[PDB]
């Protein structure tokens, strides 16, 4: 082949975190929501198999799996923590997935709610024709 391909796809990782009007019985002071998505409502499901959100051990059923959009977790809690995220690809070769450490931080009562956005670029060199077709639908 004379030809070669590099494909780039953009992901957005983010979260919202808000102080509750009233704490929960466990003493969870905050509502939050973390997510993985494409920018401008683009459809990353063409190439994403699933998104795994690994919550802090203090949460029940800490491995949260989303096989279909929206890839998000909504929860309540009292403290910020590092939240590993795995994005799995509909790829039959390497790489099968990419891993991020997401910083799920909360702000103190009195400060505006958290609305955080983290942009990530993924680059795939010479994907298979099957995977390439999926990436370029997104």
């Amino acid at each position: 082949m004379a030809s070669s391909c590099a494909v780039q796809v953009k992901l957005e990782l983010g979260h919202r975190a808000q102080v509750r009007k009233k704490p929960t019985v466990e003493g969870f002071t905050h509502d939050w929501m973390v997510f993985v998505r494409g920018p401008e409502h683009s459809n990353i499901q063409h190439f994403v198999e699933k998104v795994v959100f690994h919550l802090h051990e203090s949460f029940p059923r800490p491995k949260r799996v989303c096989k279909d959009p929206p890839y998000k977790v909504e929860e309540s809690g009292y403290a910020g923590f590092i939240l590993p995220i795995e994005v799995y690809f509909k790829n039959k070769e390497e790489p099968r997935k990419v891993r991020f450490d997401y910083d799920l931080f909360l702000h103190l009562e009195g400060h505006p709610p958290v609305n955080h956005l983290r942009c990530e670029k993924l680059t795939f060199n010479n994907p298979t024709e099957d995977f390439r077709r999926k990436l370029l639908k997104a």
Binding site: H30, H56, A79, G80, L108
Partner: peptide, 8 residues
Amino acid sequence: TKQTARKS
């Protein structure tokens, strides 16, 4: 800092 405490 604006942040709450953290857990680990």
